[PDB]
Design a protein around this nucleic acid. Structure first.
Ligand SMILES: [Mg+2]
Ligand SMILES: [Mg+2]
Ligand SMILES: [Mg+2]
Ligand SMILES: [Mg+2]
Ligand SMILES: [Mg+2]
Ligand SMILES: [Mg+2]
Ligand SMILES: [Mg+2]
Ligand SMILES: [Mg+2]
Ligand SMILES: [Mg+2]
Ligand SMILES: [Mg+2]
Ligand SMILES: [Mg+2]
Ligand SMILES: [Mg+2]
Ligand SMILES: [Mg+2]
Ligand SMILES: [Mg+2]
Ligand SMILES: [Mg+2]
Ligand SMILES: [Mg+2]
Ligand SMILES: [Mg+2]
Ligand SMILES: [Mg+2]
Ligand SMILES: [Mg+2]
Ligand SMILES: [Mg+2]
Ligand SMILES: [Mg+2]
Ligand SMILES: [Mg+2]
Ligand SMILES: [Mg+2]
Ligand SMILES: [Mg+2]
Ligand SMILES: [Mg+2]
Ligand SMILES: [Mg+2]
Ligand SMILES: [Mg+2]
Ligand SMILES: [Mg+2]
Ligand SMILES: [Mg+2]
Ligand SMILES: [Mg+2]
Ligand SMILES: [Mg+2]
Ligand SMILES: [Mg+2]
Ligand SMILES: [Mg+2]
Ligand SMILES: [Mg+2]
Ligand SMILES: [Mg+2]
Ligand SMILES: [Mg+2]
Ligand SMILES: [Mg+2]
Ligand SMILES: [Mg+2]
Ligand SMILES: [Mg+2]
Ligand SMILES: [Mg+2]
Ligand SMILES: [Mg+2]
Ligand SMILES: [Mg+2]
Ligand SMILES: [Mg+2]
Ligand SMILES: [Mg+2]
Ligand SMILES: [Mg+2]
Ligand SMILES: [Mg+2]
Ligand SMILES: [Mg+2]
Ligand SMILES: [Mg+2]
Ligand SMILES: [Mg+2]
Ligand SMILES: [Mg+2]
Ligand SMILES: [Mg+2]
Ligand SMILES: [Mg+2]
Ligand SMILES: [Mg+2]
Ligand SMILES: [Mg+2]
Ligand SMILES: [Mg+2]
Lengths: 87, 81, 205
RNA sequence: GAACUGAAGAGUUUGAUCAUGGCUCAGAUUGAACGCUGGCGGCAGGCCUAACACAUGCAAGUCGAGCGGAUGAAGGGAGCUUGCUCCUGGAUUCAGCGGCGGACGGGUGAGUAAUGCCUAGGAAUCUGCCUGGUAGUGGGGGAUAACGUCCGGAAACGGGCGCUAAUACCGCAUACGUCCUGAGGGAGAAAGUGGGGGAUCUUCGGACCUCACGCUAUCAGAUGAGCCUAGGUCGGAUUAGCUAGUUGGUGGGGUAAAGGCCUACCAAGGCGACGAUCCGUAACUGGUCUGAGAGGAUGAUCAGUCACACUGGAACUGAGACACGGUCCAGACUCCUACGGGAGGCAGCAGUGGGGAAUAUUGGACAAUGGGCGAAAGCCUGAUCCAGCCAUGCCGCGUGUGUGAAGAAGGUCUUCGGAUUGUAAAGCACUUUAAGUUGGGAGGAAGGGCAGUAAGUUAAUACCUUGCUGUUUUGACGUUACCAACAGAAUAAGCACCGGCUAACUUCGUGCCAGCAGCCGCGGUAAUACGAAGGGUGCAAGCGUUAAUCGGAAUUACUGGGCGUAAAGCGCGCGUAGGUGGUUCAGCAAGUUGGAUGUGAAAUCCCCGGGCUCAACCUGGGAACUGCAUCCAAAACUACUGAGCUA
């Protein structure tokens, strides 16, 4: 780079990336656990995973890592799958 | 934001200004949405110094458009009359 | 620009009135003004239609001392103006400032009137105008400078023009060296010999 | 009320004529170039070719009212003395963390024949800064840069250990608004800084009340962007077949959002002579030039949209990027090196090499209008405002004026008398435009600061917000525009042509030679056509020449042509798509007609005004933009529907 503000923006960008990656991994981990819980054909563990996953999903949606429509879509679809499994 | 400022028409050393309601991220005389009047810094003879349209300006202010400093001065001076 | 050269060789070539001198003695007994110039001068030289258009266009240009870019601009403006462009051209070309300060009686020749108007010696409403092309609106009081009212050239030009006719549409007060124009001249006022239609035929080709 | 009102032909095939038919000419225009020549001003314009490679210089920073740290003045006082240090304080400056901006403004037209542009629409979306409402801004923690210390390096710097700050980061406290969950319940955030103060606990440290900025959740408004549908958008059929994620469905995934956008199965579909696929070429539009119009050519300036940023890819940061002076990987080419490794991207403004017929200064300032940052001073701005070179274009003004017959001298021709250059020259007499010199001299300038005064929110004459008053305060252009005076006609004309078309003739020299030429054509011993002289004609600070478009060309003929003999009827039938359709009654309302409504960006074109001494140029109002879409009414003709009739 040439202007020092470009350098500062760059380094703040790698810091922001190294931050955001961990939290994106965390949310993906929680939804993945939930999804493999439903796909394993068990209800109680699916209930527990959903209850333990919604708070982090919504906290992250508010935190600005992901967009809120995405979180709402995830919640609705997973709840629909579990309710379908309930029968 | 969307702001009201001055677009420089006229000729060299003979200015003329259109009071333009443009998005602030546009050129001096680029695209706009409406024009409220003009200001002539040479006057002389039957030429009028300034004129604006009051109702459209009130509408634009009621929609929250920031006027520039010179535009603010000229619009308050016109409102005096 | 302007034309510099003999002012009666032109008259000899054209063979017509072509006012270009003070008119002190006469128009004839200076240059035997009936033959075209040069060695080949006695021949009448019957000339075609294009000759007619060229000859009268040169006639009008030389009598009014206008160049051809300016003249064609004048013609375009006349064509733009409504109502029989042929006489519109004459009416608009008459309102030139130098020809007015001539016809108002302030100058001996068109060239001398241009001499006076260019050197900033004439007013319109007191404001210095020195463009020998200014189109004088009706009503303006064309006058010479209060400083310049004592020059004898204006006096001699005025006494010479005292006997040249009356146009019967201007109102001129002679004591104070001032003019006044009320309304534009009519077609019948100007010399009804040269036709205007042949010019517009020339420029319509 | 005005918005237009407009159309020319000539030459050349023949011994001569009429027709057909091609060629050439007279006009208007260029981002133009070349040859001869050259005084000035105003307004504009200026690498069309190599998106070829590039030396140096400049073109994006800002905030101490976010945060530690270090620079710490002036001082209230002390020591010894006149200098320093120190207690308490403290005005300035900034390396780093942090917040905004860098996605705007600026450049270019390579790619792109359709994921682009233009016209009309519509449904499933997002959106910082701006405005209007609503509800809040409570309590904790773990780090880290800078800073020390050590190692390593040529440098950029990298690494180990220690400690610190926040409006940096993450839990915790609740949910008027929100999210999902069917009701049921559940889920999800905040940051504090600056100015004052009545009372209260108390170090009015602080708590508490107010204001200013700022922060959080949400509804709405604009502003900007994303997505879909129908119609239009160059040439070629000597390009006729193209497509297997291809066409549709179901389940899931994914995006902010609909969707084969992605995936697994289900069936074999989809597009195309109304031109699919392929090849060549090219950013599109408003518009520009021509034309009487219809059309034809075109996309220089200015404005809207799109695409790109040495070449090829990919993602991160954010509200927004696949990012024009950001990151990473690979490549080509130039450069440094301690040989370990590094650096670069002028299609940003001047500049250079090269290419070319050909396109300019390595100039000023934030003075003004905008932009970024901050609350305010203020900084940054090759955007912008001005200068430089250039007859490149348009417009305007100068090189003077009157008299002047002895019709002066030279030149040219002659019929030797004379004519012609020619009032032209000389002579006599006048003004100072422009340029030169000197002296006056507006307008682009809004605002900024200091003090006072009056109104308003609290609970308060406290702060601040708002009006006004008074003092002070700036220009690169710039020796401004403009004004006045002074001497002096002083000081500043060239180019083409003269056989016809086309305005303008004689002589001398060669003798089908030398030469001219847009088309007919001139020249071989009186050339108005060659080369020169005189004399004229045409334009004029320009004049010609070349290249390019339309016109004339009714010469691609819709307006508006033709086919017996000039070019032009298939050798002849049958017939597919397509085009066309005898007559009556009735219906419908697609064509057709009238009207209303929305749009057709601004500028440019046209009409009437205003300003610069006029014009060029600038600018107000109107007209216009034949187009497109949505509705209402009519039924003569065409189409569609039903029932007939016989030519
Ligand atoms: Mg929480
Ligand atoms: Mg949030
Ligand atoms: Mg001129
Ligand atoms: Mg013959
Ligand atoms: Mg014939
Ligand atoms: Mg700093
Ligand atoms: Mg741009
Ligand atoms: Mg270019
Ligand atoms: Mg192609
Ligand atoms: Mg924070
Ligand atoms: Mg389409
Ligand atoms: Mg498949
Ligand atoms: Mg489906
Ligand atoms: Mg599917
Ligand atoms: Mg699609
Ligand atoms: Mg095709
Ligand atoms: Mg093109
Ligand atoms: Mg191309
Ligand atoms: Mg094109
Ligand atoms: Mg392109
Ligand atoms: Mg026209
Ligand atoms: Mg025509
Ligand atoms: Mg260009
Ligand atoms: Mg544009
Ligand atoms: Mg891009
Ligand atoms: Mg790229
Ligand atoms: Mg390159
Ligand atoms: Mg690259
Ligand atoms: Mg993001
Ligand atoms: Mg960038
Ligand atoms: Mg660059
Ligand atoms: Mg450049
Ligand atoms: Mg060069
Ligand atoms: Mg060269
Ligand atoms: Mg400013
Ligand atoms: Mg700088
Ligand atoms: Mg010039
Ligand atoms: Mg030249
Ligand atoms: Mg002739
Ligand atoms: Mg010749
Ligand atoms: Mg001879
Ligand atoms: Mg000759
Ligand atoms: Mg034609
Ligand atoms: Mg032609
Ligand atoms: Mg024919
Ligand atoms: Mg034959
Ligand atoms: Mg036959
Ligand atoms: Mg056939
Ligand atoms: Mg048949
Ligand atoms: Mg048929
Ligand atoms: Mg019928
Ligand atoms: Mg039919
Ligand atoms: Mg209609
Ligand atoms: Mg328009
Ligand atoms: Mg009806």
């Amino acid at each position: 780079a040439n202007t020092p503000s470009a350098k500062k923006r760059a380094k703040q960008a790698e810091k922001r990336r190294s931050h955001n990656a961990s939290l994106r991994s965390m949310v993906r981990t929680y939804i993945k656990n939930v999804v493999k819980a439903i796909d394993a054909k068990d209800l109680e563990k699916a209930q527990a995973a959903f209850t333990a996953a919604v708070p982090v999903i919504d906290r992250m949606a508010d935190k600005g890592i992901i967009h809120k429509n995405k979180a709402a879509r995830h919640k609705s679809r997973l709840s629909g799958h579990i309710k379908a499994l309930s029968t | 934001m969307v702001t009201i400022r001055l677009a420089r028409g006229g000729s060299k050393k003979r200015p003329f200004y259109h009071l333009t309601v443009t998005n602030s991220r546009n050129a001096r005389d680029g695209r706009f949405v409406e024009r409220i009047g003009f200001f002539n810094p040479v006057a002389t003879g039957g030429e009028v110094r300034l004129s604006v349209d009051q109702e459209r300006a009130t509408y634009w202010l009621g929609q929250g458009a920031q006027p520039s400093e010179r535009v603010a001065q000229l619009l308050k001076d016109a409102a005096k009359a | 620009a302007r034309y510099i050269g003999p002012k009666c060789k032109l008259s000899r070539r054209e063979g017509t009135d072509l006012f270009l001198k003070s008119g002190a003695r006469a128009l004839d007994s200076k240059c035997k003004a009936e033959n075209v110039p040069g060695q080949h001068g006695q021949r009448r030289g019957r000339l075609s239609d294009y000759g007619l258009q060229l000859r009268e266009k040169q006639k009008v240009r030389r009598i009014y001392g206008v160049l051809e870019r300016q003249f064609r601009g004048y013609y375009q403006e006349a064509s733009r103006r409504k109502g029989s462009t042929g006489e519109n051209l004459l009416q608009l070309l008459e309102c030139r400032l130098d020809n007015v300060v001539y016809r108002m009686g302030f100058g001996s020749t068109r060239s001398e009137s241009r001499q006076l108007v260019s050197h900033k010696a004439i007013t319109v409403n007191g404001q210095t105008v020195n463009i020998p092309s200014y189109q004088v609106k009706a009503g303006d009081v064309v006058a010479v400078r209060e400083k310049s009212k004592n020059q004898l050239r204006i006096a001699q030009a005025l006494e010479l023009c005292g006997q040249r006719g009356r146009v019967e549409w201007v109102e001129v007060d002679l004591d104070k060296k001032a003019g006044t124009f009320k309304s534009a001249p009519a077609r019948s006022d100007l010399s009804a010999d040269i036709n205007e239609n042949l010019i517009v035929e020339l420029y319509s080709k």
